Amino acid sequence: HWGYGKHNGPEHWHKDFPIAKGERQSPVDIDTHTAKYDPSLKPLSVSYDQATSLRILNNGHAFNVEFDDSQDKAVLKGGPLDGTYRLIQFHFHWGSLDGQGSEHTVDKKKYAAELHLVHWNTKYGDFGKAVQQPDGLAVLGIFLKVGSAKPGLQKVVDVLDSIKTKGKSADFTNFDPRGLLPESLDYWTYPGSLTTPPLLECVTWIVLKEPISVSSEQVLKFRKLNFNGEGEPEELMVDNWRPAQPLKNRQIKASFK
Numbered sequence: 001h002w003g004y005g006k007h008n009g010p011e012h013w014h015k016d017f018p019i020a021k022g023e024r025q026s027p028v029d030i031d032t033h034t035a036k037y038d039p040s041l042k043p044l045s046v047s048y049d050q051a052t053s054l055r056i057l058n059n060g061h062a063f064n065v066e067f068d069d070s071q072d073k074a075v076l077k078g079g080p081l082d083g084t085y086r087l088i089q090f091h092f093h094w095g096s097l098d099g100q101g102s103e104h105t106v107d108k109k110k111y112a113a114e115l116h117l118v119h120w121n122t123k124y125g126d127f128g129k130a131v132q133q134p135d136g137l138a139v140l141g142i143f144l145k146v147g148s149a150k151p152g153l154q155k156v157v158d159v160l161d162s163i164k165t166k167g168k169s170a171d172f173t174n175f176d177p178r179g180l181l182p183e184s185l186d187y188w189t190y191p192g193s194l195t196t197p198p199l200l201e202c203v204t205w206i207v208l209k210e211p212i213s214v215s216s217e218q219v220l221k222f223r224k225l226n227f228n229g230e231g232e233p234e235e236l237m238v239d240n241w242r243p244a245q246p247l248k249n250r251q252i253k254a255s256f257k
C-alpha cells in the first residue's frame with residue numbers, strides 16, 4: 001500500500017499509479033514572479049454559512065473532516081471556476097518540523113502545513129464521477145505558519161485524541177469551516193491533480209496567498225496522530241506531504257496584482 005515512508009512514499013507511487021509522471025500533477029512550486037495577473041479572474045465566492053459537518057476520520061494518510069454534500073449547503077464558485085462546487089471534506093498535510101509540511105511551495109518556501117478544502121463540480125452528480133473529469137474538483141489550498149493560535153482550529157485539534165489511529169472516526173457536527181480562512185481571498189490558480197493516489201488529473205487548484213497562523217501547540221497535536229491502526233507498531237503521522245512536481249506546460253495565474 002502507498003504511503004509516505006522510505007519504501008512506499010512519493011518516489012514509489014508511479015509504479016502503481018503511472019499518472020504520477022503525468023502532464024498536470026500537483027503540488028507545484030508557485031514562482032510568484034512568473035505567475036501572471038489575470039484581470040479576467042473573478043473574486044472567489046465562498047459560501048459556507050449553511051455548511052453541515054458530520055464526522056472526522058483518520059484514514060491512515062491524514063484526517064478528514066467530512067460534510068453533508070447531499071445539498072447545496074457549502075459551495076465554492078467564481079474565481080476561475082465555471083459553475084458550482086460542493087464542499088465534501090477538508091484535511092491537512094503537515095511536517096515533522098515547522099520548516100516543512102506544505103505541498104505547494106511559494107518561491108520554494110515550505111510552510112508548516114497546508115489545508116485542503118475539497119469541492120466537487122455539481123454538474124457531475126457526485127464525487128466519484130467528478131474525479132473522472134478534468135474539471136471535476138476544486139481544491140482550496142491554505143498555507144499554515146506557526147505563530148499565534150487559530151481559534152477556529154481548536155475544536156479540530158481537541159478531537160484528534162479520539163481518532164489517533166487509522167480507521168477511527170468520531171462524530172464532528174456543527175463545525176464552521178469559515179473559522180479556518182485568512183482575511184484575504186487573493187489566490188493563485190492552475191490546473192492540477194489529487195496529491196495522493198490515485199493522483200487523478202481532475203483538480204482546479206486555488207491556493208490562497210495569505211497563510212493562516214496556528215500555534216506550535218496546535219501543530220504539535222497534529223503530530224501525535226498515527227499512520228498505523230490500533231494494535232500496530234506506532235508510526236507518527238508526520239510528513240504526509242507530496243513534494244513539488246514539474247510544472248510542465250502550465251501557467252499559474254494570480255487574482256491580484
Ligand SMILES: CCOc1ccc(S(N)(=O)=O)cc1
Nearest residue numbers: 001002007008012013015016
Ligand atoms: C506492500 C508492498 O510495498 C509497496 C506497495 C505499494 C507501493 S506504491 N502504491 O507506492 O507504488 C509501494 C510499496
Ligand SMILES: CCOc1ccc(S(N)(=O)=O)cc1
Nearest residue numbers: 116118139193194195196197
Ligand atoms: C479519493 C481521494 O480523494 C482525494 C485525494 C487527495 C486530495 S488533495 N490532497 O489533492 O486535496 C483530495 C481528495
Ligand SMILES: [Zn+2]
Nearest residue numbers: 091093116195
Ligand atoms: Zn490534500
